[PDB]
Design a protein around this ligand. Structure first.
Ligand SMILES: Nc1ncnc2c1ncn2[C@@H]1O[C@H](COP(=O)(O)OP(=O)(O)OP(O)(O)=S)[C@@H](O)[C@H]1O
Ligand SMILES: Nc1ncnc2c1ncn2[C@@H]1O[C@H](COP(=O)(O)OP(=O)(O)OP(O)(O)=S)[C@@H](O)[C@H]1O
Ligand SMILES: Nc1ncnc2c1ncn2[C@@H]1O[C@H](COP(=O)(O)OP(=O)(O)OP(O)(O)=S)[C@@H](O)[C@H]1O
Ligand SMILES: Nc1ncnc2c1ncn2[C@@H]1O[C@H](COP(=O)(O)OP(=O)(O)O)[C@@H](O)[C@H]1O
Ligand SMILES: [Mg+2]
Ligand SMILES: [Mg+2]
Ligand SMILES: [Mg+2]
Lengths: 579, 25, 577
């Protein structure tokens, strides 16, 4: 019929790419299809695995003859859900269309119906897909068994629509589909390489196809491995084919396709380049150049990360085992975002203080009332699942319930965190870091003695006490941030001034800051316990608050030429106003 | 004792639509 | 049935395309692909998705395009004729079929279909089961023809999940707001049509000011579309508004007025004369609210920075949290704030929005239910009133899920409901209040001489409110207890509120200065704040007057005097009638 396209007819005339691999998965389909009862195969796989290719490829074997005798005359038809629902405008009209196609196929023997995205039509309740209650017109044919149907449902939907419904599950044979191995991915592209080469009229290099798959899966982090490779290869050929007006380069290179991935990934070409060793070698020089202070703390972190990326040790274990421990306001948070920005991995911030209540711990694994909402899953699990290359920043870990510490111990040992929904998350490529603002109270604690001059200077001991000895064994090394120097604080003040100057440029108002003014801001905006945290408020109240009063009315409305000074006797800031 | 948990019940909405007829002549 | 965009370019029907060089490179790159050779220009309303498709044809004729695209001709589907012209069955199939043969046999020919979402929901006269989408589906899969589409963000997602086969064939292309420099240039190209229709001339400065004034005040529409509305209306205003003089030229003062009308902001706002209102807002709050001068200064200072421009434009006008003891008027200052500025006050009591299911109503209800048509209360309220005050009283009582919504508002500044209707918070001030600070030690210190062992402030607020949410707040304005001196001023206003009530009954109330002091000290409670003063004024003044008003001399109306007796230390009421 017009709704469905005959895959066998299409394969006979060409236009269908060949299927490479998937022998073990494809053979399972032939096994269940030949069954007398419960012969409806179900292709449960994640998006991009190539579920449709397995169905299209199966038809190629029938026309070619590489199937049993029973499957010789078999014909596979792909149902177009869009054609049925389109133009109905009446709940039930869609059902009438399905019956006509079903009756036609039921008459002919040895007929199969490849229902793509079957989950859309059989959704339990209101859905954003088919929006049709096709449960009524799906169980009868499945129960009758006259015509067998192939369903390309996703792993998520299968766990809810098929599992909950006994009729669907009892008349469907699950066929697990997994992503192919990296070595298998290149073989798939090599087989399909001539088709794309003949179209673009360009020849791809063997090194490009191999390197493209490695950087595609890591930098894009959007789709699955099979879809990325086919997309980048097609994208690369198109770009080089029309890059110059007259010139052209039939050959391809790794550096050429790297620029293409930058656009779809929205990352600079330098980071997208396969130069992880180069960035790792100069990791300390980059962080020290981007941020100042805590040089000793930063240098120790680079040596440890190099040990994990070398490949030694157990691969299942997590790559990141670092426990930051120092006063806040010294840039402890900034190194976590700068490290991710340089390496290209994403940044995931999970504040432990919010996850303080015992009940809140459960949210990480799953929402308490989320029975209908199984798509979101656990808060921690979903972030890791979507982003397998991202830094995890845990703040105020010292103030957490005891059960929370055990959750971290499990991943540090096995490297895999299970989910109640059943999703499998891997921390092998996820770096884990946590900060603790402990020991600062002990240092700032006023001594009970008469002289009060007693200093502790042993805050590291308190860190080991707040954490159990078991946790200390798992972590290889802990990072310690030393107290900042008054000279370093002056550079932090300039950072806020630069941002203020840029904001004023849009209005044509200048800002001059004296060297003596910076000293007042540094002392006022720096606290021993909070570090540079008050600097944001101190800069705003001292500089921005009065400015707005004059900017709203006064000489500063136009002309700019702002000037700031401080009286030496009273040590108070006075800002001169010029028109 | 641990706190109790309450579960809500959502009701689906579906309605039937009449049909007017127009004779040709 | 169709129109040749390439031929239209030669005649000049389509104005020269300005900018969008990166977008064109992305469209042509994906277009030449072996698979996914159908670009989709997803964008918002008025961004220029159709103009980009039409602009491409201009580049084809001029030859700027790579030679791969040279010799190609773009066509457009006659959406109007196909939807309604071919009402009868058979005609739609035979006429469309002819276009397929014309599309094929010429690889250089590329079709364009504006509003491609329409063909998905096609119409059938007698349910023939044949539509434009199914007819082109085999062709697109084979790749013999290439097409270009256009749709909305909310509409693009609606059809993406519903249909995966069509989504696979099409490649999404993100569109962004053009730069201000790009916007003024296009208006010059479109100037001959608008200026000639109204018989006026637009100044060069007006074009630049129009785009700047629009984005500053008008945030519902998009910059490219905004400029056309303020320009088309500006010329119309000069044609009908100056009926006596009929000014031919357009001045900068003209367009700014049109922006104010379209933006629904008080006149002279574009002139910036409203600075006086913010300049003297402080004094009005001081007289209305006593004992909170320090708190009013922090709130007033923060508001000035937003309007002054010393802040992030995406960030809202303000985000403050009011915490303190009961009766400090932390919610009274929010109410009076709206009256001073004149903007509408949006009150959202959080006691009602306490459950997870109830919090959903803030951003909208799920689809497929009776409450789908209701929409989002918070989104609807802020969209109707862009310049308004959003009051979230007793936020601590609300479920923690509501904080997730507030975290987004303070970060991005925009909130979109389930339906897809975006809401802007740039001109709305966020003023939330909490009663966590009310807790304090009621018992006094143990000892012969008491001590002021007051509990610390903000310690309990750290555990109740998450750190990330706490930091996002611009400033947490604390409210101090009302001292004995401040209570004297509070009583004075309560008598005024009582005097106006008596004015409707013909009774004039005169209270002595000594009487005011007795009422203040009688009910001055630090923990209860200002509420006891109402009960003191109620029990001592309203109760006797009410008895006389119903059964007494005050039935008609008259003067009354209140004075305390030194010997008895009790108020004495005299009625003159
Ligand atoms: N094992 C494989 N052998 C050959 N080609 C493959 C294989 N896996 C994936 N592909 C290719 O990748 C694509 C898989 O088919 P698709 O229709 O894209 O799959 P899909 O699961 O329907 O995708 P969605 O709709 O994005 S979830 C085709 O381009 C295939 O040629
Ligand atoms: N990038 C552009 N280059 C040149 N002209 C443009 C551009 N964007 C918009 N225009 C012009 O601005 C006009 C108004 O924009 P519209 O055509 O309404 O945009 P649109 O995105 O097609 O709108 P819809 O159909 O309502 S989503 C266009 O018709 C063009 O004349
Ligand atoms: N500082 C003040 N100046 C004048 N009137 C005040 C002041 N504080 C409270 N009031 C009055 O006392 C009442 C306060 O009511 P609310 O505004 O609800 O109090 P609030 O302290 O802001 O909040 P609570 O603690 O949740 S009742 C009103 O009648 C106000 O007019
Ligand atoms: N070493 C530093 N160099 C520059 N600025 C710093 C440094 N340490 C702290 N700061 C300032 O203090 C802030 C502390 O980090 P931020 O992300 O604002 O908050 P938090 O530390 O609570 O995560 C920095 O963003 C910056 O404004
Ligand atoms: Mg910091
Ligand atoms: Mg358009
Ligand atoms: Mg209140």
């Amino acid at each position: 019929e017009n709704f469905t396209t005959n895959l066998n007819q299409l394969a006979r005339v060409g236009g269908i790419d060949p299927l490479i691999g998937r022998e073990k998965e494809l053979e399972r389909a032939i096994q269940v299809l030949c069954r007398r009862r419960k012969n409806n195969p179900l292709l449960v796989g994640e998006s991009g695995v190539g579920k449709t290719a397995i169905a299209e490829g199966l038809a190629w074997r029938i026309v070619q003859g590489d199937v049993p005798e029973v499957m010789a005359d078999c014909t596979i038809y792909s149902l177009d859900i869009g054609s049925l629902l389109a133009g109905t405008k009446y709940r039930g009209d869609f059902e009438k269309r399905f019956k006509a196609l079903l009756k036609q196929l039921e008459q002919d023997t040895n007929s199969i119906l490849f229902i793509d995205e079957i989950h859309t039509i059989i959704g339990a309740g209101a859905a954003s897909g088919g929006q049709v209650d096709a449960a009524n017109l799906i169980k009868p044919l499945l129960s009758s068994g006259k015509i067998r149907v192939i369903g390309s449902t996703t792993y998520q939907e299968f766990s809810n629509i098929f599992e909950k419904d006994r009729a669907l599950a009892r008349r469907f044979q699950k066929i697990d589909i997994t992503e192919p191995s990296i070595e298998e991915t290149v073989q798939i592209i090599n087989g399909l390489k001539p088709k794309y080469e003949a179209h673009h009229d360009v020849r791809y290099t063997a090194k490009a196809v191999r390197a493209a798959v490695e950087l595609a899966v890591k930098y894009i982090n959007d789709r699955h491995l099979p879809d990325k490779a086919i997309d980048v290869i097609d994208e690369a050929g198109a770009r080089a084919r029309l890059m110059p007006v007259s010139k052209r380069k039939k050959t391809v290179n790794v550096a050429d396709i790297e620029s293409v991935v930058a656009r779809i990934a929205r990352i600079p070409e330098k980071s997208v380049s396969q130069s992880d060793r180069d960035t790792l070698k100069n990791l300390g020089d980059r962080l020290k150049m981007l941020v100042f202070g805590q040089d000793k703390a930063i240098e120790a972190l680079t040596e440890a990360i190099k040990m994990a990326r070398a490949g030694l040790g157990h691969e299942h274990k997590p790559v990141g085992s670092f426990l930051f421990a120092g006063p806040t306001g010294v840039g402890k948070t900034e190194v976590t975002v700068q490290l991710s920005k340089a390496l290209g991995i994403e940044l995931l911030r999970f504040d432990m203080s919010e996850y303080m209540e015992r009940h809140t711990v459960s949210r990480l694994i799953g929402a308490p009332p989320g029975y209908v909402g199984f798509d979101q899953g656990g808060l921690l699990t979903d972030a890791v699942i979507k982003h397998p290359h991202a830094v995890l920043l845990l703040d105020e870990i010292e103030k957490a319930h005891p059960d929370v510490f055990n959750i971290l111990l499990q991943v540090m040992d096995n490297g895999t965190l299970t989910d109640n929904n059943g999703r499998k998350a891997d921390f092998r490529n996820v770096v884990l870091v946590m900060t603790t603002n402990a020991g600062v109270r002990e240092t700032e604690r006023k001594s009970i003695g008469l002289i009060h001059q007693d200093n502790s200077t042993d805050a590291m001991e308190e860190i080991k006490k707040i954490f159990t000895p078991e946790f200390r064994n798992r972590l290889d090394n802990i990072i310690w941030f030393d107290h900042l120097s008054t000279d370093v604080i002056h550079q932090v003040v300039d950072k806020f001034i630069v941002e203020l100057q840029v904001q004023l440029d849009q209005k044509g108002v200048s800002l001059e800051v004296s060297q003596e003014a910076r000293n007042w801001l540094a002392e006022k905006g720096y606290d021993r316990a909070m570090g540079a945290r008050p600097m944001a408020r101190v800069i705003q109240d001292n500089l921005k608050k009065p400015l707005a009063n004059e900017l709203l009315f006064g000489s500063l409305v136009d002309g700019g030429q702002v000037t700031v000074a401080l009286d030496k006797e009273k040590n108070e800031l006075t800002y001169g106003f010029q028109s | 004792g641990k706190t109790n948990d309450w579960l809500d019940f959502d009701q689906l909405a579906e309605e039937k639509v009449r049909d007017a007829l127009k004779p040709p002549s």
